[model samples]
Target chain A: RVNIGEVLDKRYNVYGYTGQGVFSNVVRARDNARANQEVAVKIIRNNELMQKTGLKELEFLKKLNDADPDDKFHCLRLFRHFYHKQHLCLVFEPLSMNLREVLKKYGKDVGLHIKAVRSYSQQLFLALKLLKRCNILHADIKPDNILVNESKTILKLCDFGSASHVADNDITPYLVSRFYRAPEIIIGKSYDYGIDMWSVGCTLYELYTGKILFPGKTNNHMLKLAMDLKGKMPNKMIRKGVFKDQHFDQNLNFMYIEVDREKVTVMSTINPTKDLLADLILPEDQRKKVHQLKDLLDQILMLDPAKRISINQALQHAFIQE
Target chain B: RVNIGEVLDKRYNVYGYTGQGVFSNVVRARDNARANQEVAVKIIRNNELMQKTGLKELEFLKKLNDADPDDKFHCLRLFRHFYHKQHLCLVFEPLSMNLREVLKKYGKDVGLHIKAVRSYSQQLFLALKLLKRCNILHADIKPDNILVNESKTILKLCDFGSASHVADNDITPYLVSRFYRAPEIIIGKSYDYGIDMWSVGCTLYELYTGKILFPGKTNNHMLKLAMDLKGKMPNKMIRKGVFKDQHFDQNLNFMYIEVREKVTVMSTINPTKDLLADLIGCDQRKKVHQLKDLLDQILMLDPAKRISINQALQHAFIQE
Candidate 1:
């Protein structure tokens, strides 16, 4: 129903209809009241549940923006929101492509430039800190959720559709995208802000290596691959999860079964942690920086949510500082 | 009425809706019958006049493609045409942004890279020579009608909506866009393939200097600017125009009158050809002179004196 050339709210003149998701359609519009500046208007579907979720996203955006009023934390800035013909509409400053597209176009087979990775990592860390301060958990954090500015210099975190209060701690096993899903979430452990840090680690690794760190087929496969890279999860950590019986036994050993309708057999081996760092696609001059990156990833990729490095400490790490 | 995510003509699966012009709505579709390849489907408006015009464009595209055969002439390739829901749909291979967007993105205020200008000029000249062979006039030639490939290396001529046979020579004065309109069409002179050549000169100048050469508010103002750059028109040429009395007096001098709802007066002066070349943004001395010389013959005030497509192809700049 969002026509290309029509104006909405007597302000935004729609110029282009971008793509749509299941619950929302986005259009690129120009603000006639503000000197024809370009903006993106997300037109939410006029349904009860979808409108409720859209308003929840607006609530999260307002909280994040209130804490960082100048939009300095690299989170998406929501300019305003209103209803158009019974559908909720959200207006945001237009950004170029998502990090996934940036990787596809600029990073081909090897990954992004090291300098770009550095800049993006620092900005995302700042966004995580901001979210932490507000006690909000951005349940979805992946390359697709991160957008870059037109010049590809500044990065912003977006898509708060799955976000919730950190204190809520809902039992959502499938909280994030499959490849970037944290192990704690997969094991049905009560999660905190550290879940986002785990995704950041996965995102940063993909940016530098031009490959998904964990290309898992199922939750069991995801945990199996995680164990291969970071070694087996600590027994106490597995003991606390409500869904522990699904993957582990009373002896705290990881249970494994293979079927034709199978997730996977745990016997298949992947590269160990040392080998993952040894094959980085960086130049000779950047060899020392790769070691610094390995040290940072070590602290961020910890299986225990409590042991994961805080966003404040990660921002001050040698990799980001240097 | 085009539905996204729906298959049209049983083969073209529509993926996205690109914009629409007055008579056509374009969509980016994936060809299921052709290995899921991407193509543009132009859905012509359902009307008698527009459908007839759409068929004419298809005919012209077939003629151009028949002559070139291998798609070497830089003209658009028409794959197939079908009717969907009583609307004429023409499918063609998808291309990247047009030359106008190329100028806006890559050529900001300083124009394009000189190497890009050379490549695009050579390919467009080949297209013009091919059109001359087919005795067709691409009545509308502008930056918006020339498309570039994804790598920005290859250029393809498109938008045959305004095209007609040269022999059919209908005397419609307002033929091309205002900026790229040729003086022959503006002054009511029966034009040939040289009209496109004049637009090529204007396009090349803008690509090199990021400026429109003959930006006229009206046709009278357009001829005035053309005369300023190429010097005054030949009196004999003006005498032969069907609308010669519109801008010229009995003495064949250009008339001078400025009305409130009117074009410009003849007294407003413009830069001469020497000054136009003196201000080119080119760096190398020899290249600037070569480009200037090539533009001179192409932009000659008189269509009879303008360089033919074959002559412009062998120019110094294009050869190098």
Candidate 2:
């Protein structure tokens, strides 16, 4: 319902569309009251379900803003919200391209500079710490949700549309995107804040290798690929799952479907680690840092949430602390 | 917002209030159009959230009624529904008091006769079969939700307020009542239709003993009581739980809080089995053993290991 060059709420003037999400359309706008300062406005879809979701986002945004009044934590800042033409409009500080776009521009299929990856990882860890302090889970934390500032020196987490407070059981299995989803969610196990840690690891891997990690076409394929990297999921986890029968067999062996066909077969082999050592710049001076990076990834990408590393440990690790 | 003796929708006449539920107040009524035949009318509360819930109930009721037009499956039947005084009202076939009331009156602190328990168990299995066929999880299946006919010879399941289609993860630990809640739900694991089976086992035990099977003071005590009856939960199940650390310690041992106190202690011993043999009097030893075996399968800790409705329907105990 927005028109270009038309002022909304008699204050902010719409300029052009920036992007679209499942619940809202984001647009670039100018704050005429603040001397034409650029801002981003999210125009929520004018429907009952989406409206309810948008209102929830606004509520969480308020809590996050209150928790970090000084804006020390690396999280998106919500300036204000209002109703425009029966649509809920949320105004936020304008940010540059997301981390995905950053990787596409500089990571030329090999990877980004180790220094840059370290900086972004530290910032993301701080964001997760803030979320944990507020008893919230981002639920969806991909490269697209991490936004870089204009100078590209800082990062802030965005998109609270899929966020929720921690609960005993997750409401649905479709919370996290497929590729970056946690193993617990994939195998139909209960999840908690550790899910975000798994996604953060996946995002950091993508930043270091211009490719999606664990990019399986289906949930079954995802588990197979995860096992190839993390070894088998604990037999007891499978034994307790609601959707285990769809992915595992009677003996708790992973079942792999025939490629592009309907036949099923038992999985026997697994390649434990990604080829992070191959096809990368390895020198005596950078070898130790890269090793620390691999070690950090291993700790964060644990199969069990109870065993996964916490934000405290990640921030104090050699890779980040150094 | 229901008044006694008031005629609603120009069809049903409300006679008296039967009980109040979370979403609506149920009232005894007479279908004046059907020769004053007695029925139950559910008058939903006039609000946004409850109204949405009531509408969903109505939708599920339609599917259930359509699936079992013959009503051979022991599930409550919805005769009709209409909005009265801006309140969504549902009409259902009138049933006698629930099984809880039955046990209170006739149990005598021992239990119902084994024959009656067997009959009710069979009817409940059929109800679960129908629900599974519809891809629905009753979620709440305590003795209070099962009602008997006036003759006390027939059983039908009621209350779809907490019902939902089986999902990958349950929304909360508070789905089933604490006394009859499943172990998976207690430990914060994903659940499915197997939760209903666990509740069915608890209900059957209550029917045979005239007491609750796992009546814990709190969710923590609930787990302790469960362990007392069914041994310790598998270490791996505790490791996979989101709420595990709250109930278990670093070594993965069960933690028990002091009763009416603040101290915590580790649990090292468990007393398995519910003494079904002691409380239950049976003339046939073979039939009693079969009943105990069926209970064991239904009350398995892991939901995946719990007996399915079809399997329980054909089990040796149910067959006899």
Candidate 3:
């Protein structure tokens, strides 16, 4: 059936698919019992990681929805979860599009309108604020995880699979999509909610420039790209990873080696590039708004996790007042 | 200057218009404060009735949201409300269209799809149950008030100007109505959420027939239409209206009413069960039987014997 209105779980009548993710397919389903109460149900295959993400998302969203019940903070609310066939189906308060789709949709000249980015940024900060207040780290703070309502007014933080308890000590030196991965996680520093703030900076930068700040393909490439832009990965942090030898040395020189196929070892590229602010100079007409946003970006997109702008502080940043 | 993108409360940047009503104009606004979160801000002018409706709607919605917080019931959630200049601005979850728009949008084949209406009706019934449970009456439960989402699958009840607290001694839902109005309103008596029940029947019937069940211009014509369809009002009830003398004669043969020229030619003359099927469409007699039986209970002439939202919902027409 190319496109059949297939009923599942004896309750959900999935009419169409909205998108396909790595681990699951997002389908638009009607709660047959609830009289056309439409929901976005992610039908996950019976895989370990997929099951883990499903349960983790369900738990966190349930708690978040309970604490801040009425969706006042724009946190994506989970409707309910059920097992259909062999897949774990998690239902959600169906949102129309994600931030990426919205950015692509409102295709104006220079990326998004400054006003539109500002609008999205405010909600992004608010979403982080809610998570930080509740002691949860979004772990993955990217445009794709930020779902937009039909009106694009309500931007909800979704896909809490990577989201973890802020207090949980053990963490991978890797997370989120490559571009939005914060420096702390990349260079293997003990990260906090600050990692998420850094990711926010990257997400916003992409939204503004219509290009990812760090579009590295390989993990080493991503690290090199981030380091090139933000400058050196701090000495203390560089020596902190279990796989320090995999990417860097004692002097913080790139020690990673890649051998592809049979013959060639393509050494990762590391061209030292300036930070996000280098090219943001605006004319007198667009200076205040442009400068203010640039200033916030500088604070959030910092090389050091210790100096990275906190979500709360970012909300208080002068640019957000606009 | 007449119709500009007016910023309300210095926060909502009203960019475009969505629709207009008697008291308010709905504009699609981005909340400057919430990262340009899109909302449908219904900007209501500062008038006694307008302000009253705004405040009352705010109160009722806030309370409803608190009770059914997750929107599990699919109750229309209000983002927030604020005052700007002389107008009250209410931010809401932006819904795309109304059920009427959907009915026409899906096409003029008798009415809406049977499965579609069944799905919409159960949720509508659920919304009414929530309202009744809280002693609230959503006086206007028309297809217009029931807003559909972008998917056209999710239906939510909106417009609370005519809504009121049932516990309030003087609950008046008299904004205006004929098609959905219960006899309690026409004959001048205190009406409750039960009037809203009568309305659901009217709303569904219109959806089924692609026609208003009681499309009468005058008050007399409307009551006559209801009576003519329901096969005459009972003697005890007919003799009991405050304005009974003007509408019904002393002998109660429907005096001054157009018997042959207007109503009876259709109602009193040749009303059959098959007539009901045609109204609901004859394509599927089995489905038509299910819906017509449900409609009869909902359109019961007496408000006292009118089916409750729970009972009406359980009818085979609404349930699978």
Candidate 4:
């Protein structure tokens, strides 16, 4: 019922490609209808007919729409998916820039603006809560997925390609983008919505410090970073016997052996700060009144994800009170 | 209509717990129907009403079952999800030790069994292929996910809670267990089935050498190890504008400064063997052979060169 030729009106001008991924190519397109609205049209090429990742996107969009048709603030609206000269075209709403872009431009400077950080963190928490309510895991939640409009008043969380529904009876294992990934994900533990909370904590830290909190170069390094910062894994968790006999010692020992022992000298000195907690909130009044930010960070950044705070509790944090 | 009290006969005793996960607990339950038919039942616990993670697990299982009914071999079968008192129960088939346990017991000596390694690799590949076909990313594909049966003849891929369908429109970023993660995942780039292939490469290396190919201790260190082993990211793949003009210097100017220096030393001194070629059959005429036929050779070496899954399927390394 849709026509690609008609949708490509005079207002829509195709510009050079901004990026190309494994399944799609993003082109900068401008819409003529609304004051020359600029948008990114992700065009998927069907090189090997059957091998297409676009299908996954289509499935996710349909599911998302089915879940919440009225919800527009947290998700990217799908305009249409059609064929143009044998290529698949996925048209979406135009966004100003992503959180990654904002970080690149103002990450370091953001530390000075505690108010903005607080506001952004609150919005991210809200988005995560919405996602959790729907029982969906936004597996990827790095700065790249958070997009802003031209006014920058709202932050829309996009990209559902990695999102999956948790099984009713299964304890789904690790599912998250590395770097921002949680400890449970790192240790190959099945997780649920807590993975998203871990990502939010990582994003908050990166925005405030302009640096990744746990930037491990390898899996073992990542694990060590988490353990060192949050404390060693609980003995009960290890004694569960899921991975007790795993060749982790042989495979993981090398990662530990390669640690720069000199780096350990600074480990004890990096103390927690009240200032760091203050920068994470927005309004001065809210910042002054809220004292649980540090405690929340402790729980969110815990080495054991199973013990981390849930979205419901996170929403109840004092910082969320506008 | 089925009741847990009736289904679980008196003979099947609910022994404490064998394992505990975010959403489920593995409990040892004796099968009353048959002698020595002891099976493990995974009980999915209800996280005090406020827990949304439990619901996520339930949602994913239904989708996975719909995707492929015959994929029971690739994953643990969920017998049911019913409320028992105030707790949720998720019963599953029992499994023996995993590849990790085998390695711990035998130490590095487990690498000597080339045929066993080949068999496990084939099963893993099949599971991966099935998952890919369904557009689902296993995300967590490590030694722990591979479970052995009583006789150890069958290797089943357990755990799917983290697995998700790859969206049709966008390239999903890397979302897997770290140590066996792919190079693309470390750099925060969009990844695809290639990630599974990379993990497969890691699993193969570990299976044969009893050692991890890239044992990175930190995120930066892991990136360095990948760059050292797999080569640096292609310049074309880098979006200078998006990454904010970040560039990697040939002389180690980034966070992985130490890794670059160490890799240079390791490469010059060790000169590692081409393990990938031996396992998946290489193009080099000198080393070319059926992977199944070269089990002895493949099991003793690591997977250094990147071997395509297609090449592996044709290799004599598989029993079938």
Choose the strongest candidate by TM-score: 2
For model 4 the local lDDT of residue B220 reads 55
TM-score of each predicted structure versus truth: 0.49, 0.50, 0.46, 0.43
Total backbone collisions for each predicted model: 0, 0, 4, 50
Q: Per-residue CA lDDT of candidate 3, range A1-322, in tens?
A: 2144888778888888887855678889888889989898888767887787778878888878888876667688887888876677888988898877777875742467676778888888888878877888887778888888887766888888777888884657667777887766766667788877888888887788777778877677777677667666667777766666667754567754445752323333445576555554345535656656776787676677775666655664546756
Cα lDDT, model 4, residue A146: 81
Residue A199 of model 4 has an lDDT of 90
Instruction: State each model's CA lDDT, in order.
Output: 0.82, 0.82, 0.73, 0.59
- What order do you get sorting by TM-score, best first? 2, 1, 3, 4
Off by over 4 Å in 1: A257-274, A282-284, B1-320
Q: What does candidate 4 score on TM?
A: 0.43
- Tell how far residue B47 is off in model 2, in angstroms: 75
Every model's DockQ: 0.00, 0.01, 0.01, 0.01
Give per-residue CA lDDT, model 2, range A132-166, as digits (tens). Answer: 99989998898888999888898989999888888
Q: Which candidate, 3 or 4, has the higher lDDT?
A: 3
lDDT of 2 at B301: 81
Against the true structure, candidate 1 reaches a TM-score of 0.49
